[PDB]
Amino acid sequence: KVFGRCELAAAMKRHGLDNYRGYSLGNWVCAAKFESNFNTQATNRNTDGSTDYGILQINSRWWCNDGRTPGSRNLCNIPCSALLSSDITASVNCAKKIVSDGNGMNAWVAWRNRCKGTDVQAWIRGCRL
Ligand SMILES: [Cl-]
Ligand SMILES: [Cl-]
Ligand code: NA
Known part of the structure; x- marks a missing residue:
């Protein structure tokens, strides 16, 4: 599914x-935009042989089993x-564990390089929330 x-x-x-571990909602939306373009089915293989899965590009070296x-x-x-589903529950529950692991949202490279320190509230502007 490609979300709006x-x-x-x-x-x-x-x-x-929203505000989970102190990260406002726009941080999470911004991370998803640049990790996956809002596509739950996104996959990307890494040099080390691991693969990143889903809307938040969660990595198989630590977080999920892909058998390879x-x-x-x-x-x-x-x-x-499970991280590729149209239902984002499994991705969100896993992301809560990741963000709690010590480095916060710096675990997501696209967040660090493209969202951190920017006006992330722009990502939720105009939305009925
Ligand atoms: Cl957009
Ligand atoms: Cl933090
Ligand atoms: Na694994």
Whole structure:
């Protein structure tokens, strides 16, 4: 599913991401925009053989099992395919674990390089929330 901007903001808010660990909703929308272009089905393979999955590009070395990342962990206890669903629940629940792991949203490279320090409230402007 490719979400619209305000549709994704509303879904993220319903699932408790607004101000989660102190990160306002626009941070999460901005991260999704630049990680996946709001597409739940996005995948990207990394040099180390891991793959990033879904709207928040969650990585198989640590967070989910894809059967093809040797020596990896599955700290979200899910198959990586669950992160591609039109229902964002599994991605949000896993992202809550990631953002709690010590480095905050810096775990998402696109957030660090393209959202951090910018006017992220712009990403929720005009939305009925
Ligand atoms: Cl957009
Ligand atoms: Cl933080
Ligand atoms: Na894994």
